[PDB]
Amino acid sequence: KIPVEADFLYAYSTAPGYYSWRNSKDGSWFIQSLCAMLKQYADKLEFMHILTRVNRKVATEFESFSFDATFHAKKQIPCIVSMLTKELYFY
Amino acid sequence: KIPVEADFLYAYSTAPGYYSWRNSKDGSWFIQSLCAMLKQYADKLEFMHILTRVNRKVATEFESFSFDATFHAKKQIPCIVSMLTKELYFY
Amino acid sequence: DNSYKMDYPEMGLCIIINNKNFHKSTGMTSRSGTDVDAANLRETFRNLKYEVRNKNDLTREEIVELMRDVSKEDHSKRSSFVCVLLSHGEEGIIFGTNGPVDLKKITNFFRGDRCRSLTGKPKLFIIQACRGTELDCGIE
Amino acid sequence: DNSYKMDYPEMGLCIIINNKNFHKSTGMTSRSGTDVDAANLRETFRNLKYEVRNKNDLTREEIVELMRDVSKEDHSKRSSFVCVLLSHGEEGIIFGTNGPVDLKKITNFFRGDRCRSLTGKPKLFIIQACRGTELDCGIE
Numbered sequence: 001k002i003p004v005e006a007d008f009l010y011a012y013s014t015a016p017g018y019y020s021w022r023n024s025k026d027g028s029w030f031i032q033s034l035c036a037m038l039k040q041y042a043d044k045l046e047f048m049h050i051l052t053r054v055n056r057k058v059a060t061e062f063e064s065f066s067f068d069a070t071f072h073a074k075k076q077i078p079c080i081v082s083m084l085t086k087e088l089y090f091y
Numbered sequence: 092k093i094p095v096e097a098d099f100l101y102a103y104s105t106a107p108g109y110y111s112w113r114n115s116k117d118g119s120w121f122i123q124s125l126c127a128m129l130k131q132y133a134d135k136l137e138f139m140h141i142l143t144r145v146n147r148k149v150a151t152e153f154e155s156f157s158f159d160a161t162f163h164a165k166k167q168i169p170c171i172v173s174m175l176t177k178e179l180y181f182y
Numbered sequence: 183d184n185s186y187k188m189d190y191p192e193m194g195l196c197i198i199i200n201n202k203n204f205h206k207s208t209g210m211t212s213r214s215g216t217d218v219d220a221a222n223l224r225e226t227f228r229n230l231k232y233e234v235r236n237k238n239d240l241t242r243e244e245i246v247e248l249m250r251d252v253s254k255e256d257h258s259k260r261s262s263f264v265c266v267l268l269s270h271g272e273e274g275i276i277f278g279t280n281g282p283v284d285l286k287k288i289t290n291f292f293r294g295d296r297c298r299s300l301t302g303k304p305k306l307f308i309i310q311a312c313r314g315t316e317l318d319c320g321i322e
Numbered sequence: 323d324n325s326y327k328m329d330y331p332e333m334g335l336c337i338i339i340n341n342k343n344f345h346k347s348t349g350m351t352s353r354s355g356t357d358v359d360a361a362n363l364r365e366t367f368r369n370l371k372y373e374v375r376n377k378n379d380l381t382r383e384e385i386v387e388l389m390r391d392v393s394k395e396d397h398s399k400r401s402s403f404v405c406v407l408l409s410h411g412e413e414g415i416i417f418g419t420n421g422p423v424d425l426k427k428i429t430n431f432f433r434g435d436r437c438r439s440l441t442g443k444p445k446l447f448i449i450q451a452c453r454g455t456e457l458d459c460g461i462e
């Protein structure tokens with residue numbers, strides 16, 4: 001007999017209420033940094049631990065660029081939401 | 092130059108939209124299991140990793156008990172929300 | 183144990199729903215490059231034993247079916263369920279190629295008692311879209 | 323590095339706001355046992371070098387001040403900020419001893435550009451309260 005909302009996990013590209021940035025060329029900030037980590041790390045680390053550098057690698061090395069006073073110079077931060085009940089290691 | 096919503100962390104006692112259970116005697120499910128983990132583990136594990144058994148230790152070994160058809164036999168699941176950009180080890 | 187069980191004869195089923203060309207009536211801008219993503223993810227989860235199935239430009243009343251279809255499936259022998267989404271959106275919402283839909287009545291079909299085979303198995307929902315309309319100026 | 327910086331001359335400042343006796347007018351039930359918690363947490367974070375300060379039955383227009391007071395403080399030499407909350411509530415909301423308050427305009431005072439000293443430092447907000455009113459029947 002266990003909770004039904006558990007074992008879930010939501011790793012959002014951005015935090016609540018904000019805009020999510022995607023590149024007209026390469027692809028979503030969050031989405032690339034993601035695969036990019038799951039590439040080097042999906043066999044060394046955990047998952048949440050993996051999800052944190054994703055965030056790191058998007059808060060640190062990314063930034064918006066535009067002609068619109070309004071959209072120029074903006075950042076992003078993903079959001080890791082977990083209802084999981086155990087760690088996860090892909091293997 | 093970094094995101095302002097990052098480095099945050101919200102570990103809720105329950106998931107979005109649900110009720111949170113607390114004991115008229117011992118204390119909040121989530122709150123005890125919490126200290127209880129930070130007790131044994133705050134010097135062995137990480138933090139998120141620590142937050143997961145909290146969830147585990149509340150999804151597994153806890154359950155509501157009442158005379159009200161309506162509140163009897165219910166579960167809980169905490170919610171770990173992280174905008175942190177690095178792991179955390181208390182020491 | 184502390185770590186999840188990940189060694190069933192199948193590792194998973196990774197469903198990436200790439201949405202990009204929005205019906206004009208919805209007045210929804212296009213998503214230049216989702217494909218790069220969808221293509222990258224498609225490869226990233228293919229590299230770890232996942233039956234990935236990329237579906238594109240589906241409608242809200244298309245995405246749900248898909249789901250209701252996926253949740254009603256024997257997953258008895260599978261170690262997880264990854265469900266990448268790609269589209270636009272408002273908080274809690276999620277866009278189909280005609281109009282909005284609610285993130286929650288999506289995830290529901292997997293909720294403990296709903297999707298049984300997937301009980302005690304990680305349901306990972308990666309979502310790549312707008313969660314409202316604030317801007318992050320940053321500092322330091 | 324991958325791990326956060328945790329070795330400043332001070333480890334932290336753990337603010338536990340225990341709320342329990344709600345003004346009758348608000349028609350808010352009481353919280354039988356928060357104290358056990360508040361007492362347990364108070365000890366749990368005292369055991370790891372945190373200046374814990376337990377404040378009780380504060381009002382929404384009391385909690386904010388507290389905050390605005392805490393965020394306007396030299397934390398230049400401190401490794402983190404834990405902010406346990408204990409009360410009742412609705413989603414996003416959080417109750418004072420007179421009426422609701424919003425979780426967000428609380429956390430704001432720490433937001434990158436607001437609370438500077440606390441930039442690149444973990445702001446942990448543990449919250450123990452209701453997030454709405456659904457019931458979890460469970461399964462298996």
Ligand SMILES: *[C@@](O)(CSCc1ccccc1)[C@H](CC(=O)O)NC(=O)[C@@H](NC(=O)Cc1cc(Br)ccc1OC)C(C)C
Pocket residue numbers: 019020021022023024063064065066071213268269270271272310311312313314315
């Ligand atoms: C959001 O969903 C757009 S807002 C969604 C919305 C729904 C209902 C009502 C109102 C608004 C998407 C998410 C996604 O990527 O699918 N985000 C964007 O479209 C994003 N634009 C860009 O990333 C493009 C971009 C890139 C740079 Br660098 C500089 C400027 C710029 O803007 C055109 C946001 C920022 C609009």
Ligand SMILES: *[C@@](O)(CSCc1ccccc1)[C@H](CC(=O)O)NC(=O)[C@@H](NC(=O)Cc1cc(Br)ccc1OC)C(C)C
Pocket residue numbers: 110111112113114115154155156157162353408409410411412450451452453454455
């Ligand atoms: C919730 O905040 C109560 S609902 C909050 C609300 C706000 C605005 C409008 C409407 C409702 C609290 C959270 C907290 O612990 O502070 N949750 C409860 O009071 C909780 N009750 C109990 O845990 C007590 C209990 C324990 C057992 Br075992 C069996 C039954 C029972 O219920 C009295 C919920 C479940 C009401």
